[PDB]
């Protein structure tokens, strides 16, 4: 049995929308209790120290704690796609000096897509690879991209990016196989994609 | 703040290696943490001051030494596949505890296994530019192993950040094999100007973790050594 409890998620949550985590833990006696954020491959940083019951802010964050119902909670108020991270709870129990870690919470902040343009476009290598790349882009937030079940044929999650300049974010996935059944029109089928998905030529 | 060395390591099964956590904070507690996929942190040791150290959740197989406040050893004698996972250092005042940046290590039976990323970089399609007045090229670093690589984009000299979007986690090249290989793929979308002005100098930067030079290597192909593998674009019209 678990001593800090967190939903794995992933919790999706709209871009502007209040991003809502939450954090159960069984010593009643604990006395620190902590949020931090963890981007992939990267190393936790401090977002909230709690102590007293009630609110605590510290810009957009909001930490939350009740000992009476054993819960403590973050709110990312105007959440942004670069919230998106793995949020760990941590709680330092009764007479404990170091702190004991929940298993983290994973938050998707999905952009909002204000003309989705949705398309599969082919890439050719700049230099020689036996890759064929297909890239599908500028879909709505909704759409959700599968792995293939087709051996040899790779396909990348999707994956947000932000062109801050012209204060313009958008999704795409990548395709690629050297196989010579692999075509652009054919490489997303395992995902549930808009018809009026552009494929040109 | 807290520095760990080193950032990466391969070690075959039974070799040794040492994990430094340094921090001039004058925090008198040190703690050393394993991260493995769908678990909490697990501590391994922990030291209350200057030559103590105690046991955290998971010390089996670790030896730690507390030489100075500044100072945290984390010794691994005989490496066993298991000890693979990602090891964090930390350091509080009093409770609150800053983290080093991690170690990745990977144990292997066999070293022949780890192979450096081939990286290409594919330009964007017309029809992109046409139809949006955009133009997203993408890199693919693939048969890559074990997932120790740093991607970075430069543009005309410089790391961008801006139009980038780069896998969180890399894919297997065969999910099956449990030491299946990997590919993680980026992009970065530029304006169709800023493309097809050829003044503009595109290159992924793949920065790969693998043997030390010091590693016996007998095989034909190159060592696959810490290395960064690069693929370059230019703009056109
Ligand atoms: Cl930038």
């Known amino acids: 049995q678990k001593e800090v409890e967190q939903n794995s998620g992933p919790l999706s949550v709209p871009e502007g929308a209040i991003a809502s985590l939450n954090c159960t833990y069984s010593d009643r006696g604990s006395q620190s209790f902590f949020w931090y954020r963890q981007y992939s491959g990267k190393s936790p940083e401090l977002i909230m120290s709690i102590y007293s019951n009630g609110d605590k802010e510290d810009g957009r964050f909001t930490a939350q704690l009740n000992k009476a119902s054993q819960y403590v909670s973050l709110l990312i108020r105007d959440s942004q796609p670069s919230d998106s991270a793995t949020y760990l709870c941590?709680?330092?129990?009764?007479?404990?000096?170091?702190?004991?870690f929940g298993s983290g919470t994973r938050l998707q902040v999905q952009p909002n897509i204000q003309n989705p343009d949705p398309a599969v476009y082919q890439l050719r290598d700049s230099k020689s690879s036996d890759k064929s790349v297909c890239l599908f882009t500028d879909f709505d937030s909704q759409t959700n991209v599968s792995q293939s079940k087709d051996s040899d044929v790779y396909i990348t999650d999707k994956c947000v990016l932000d062109m801050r300049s012209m204060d313009f974010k958008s999704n795409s996935a990548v395709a690629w196989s050297n196989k010579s059944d692999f075509a652009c029109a054919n490489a997303f089928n395992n995902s549930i994609i808009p018809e009026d998905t552009f494929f040109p030529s | 703040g807290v520095t760990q060395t080193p950032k990466f390591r391969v070690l075959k099964t039974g070799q040794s290696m040492t994990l430094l956590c340094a921090q001039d904070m004058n925090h008198e507690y040190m703690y050393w943490y394993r991260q493995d996929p769908g678990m909490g942190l697990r501590l391994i040791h922990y030291?209350?001051?200057?030559?103590?150290?105690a046991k955290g959740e998971v010390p089996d197989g670790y030896n730690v030494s507390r030489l100075k406040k500044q100072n945290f050893l984390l010794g691994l004698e005989s490496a066993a596949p298991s000890q693979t996972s990602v090891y964090f250092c930390?350091?509080?005042?009093?409770?609150?505890?800053?983290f080093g940046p991690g170690t990745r290590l990977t144990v292997l039976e066999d070293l022949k296994n780890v192979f450096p990323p081939e990286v290409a970089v594919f330009e964007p399609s017309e029809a992109e530019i046409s139809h949006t007045q955009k133009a997203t090229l993408v890199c693919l670093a693939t048969g890559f192993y074990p997932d120790h690589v740093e991607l970075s984009w430069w543009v005309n000299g410089k790391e961008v950040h801006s139009g980038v979007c780069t896998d969180p986690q890399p894919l297997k090249e065969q999910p099956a094999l449990n030491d299946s290989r990997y590919a993680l793929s980026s992009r970065l979308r530029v304006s169709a100007t800023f493309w097809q002005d050829p003044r503009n100098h595109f290159r992924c930067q793949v920065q790969f973790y693998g043997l030390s030079e010091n590693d016996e290597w007998t095989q034909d192909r190159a060592k696959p050594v810490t290395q960064i593998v690069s693929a370059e674009a230019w703009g056109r019209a």
């Open positions: 941590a709680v330092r129990g009764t007479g404990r000096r170091a702190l004991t």
């Open positions: 030291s209350v001051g200057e030559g103590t150290t």
């Open positions: 930390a350091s509080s005042f009093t409770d609150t505890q800053y």
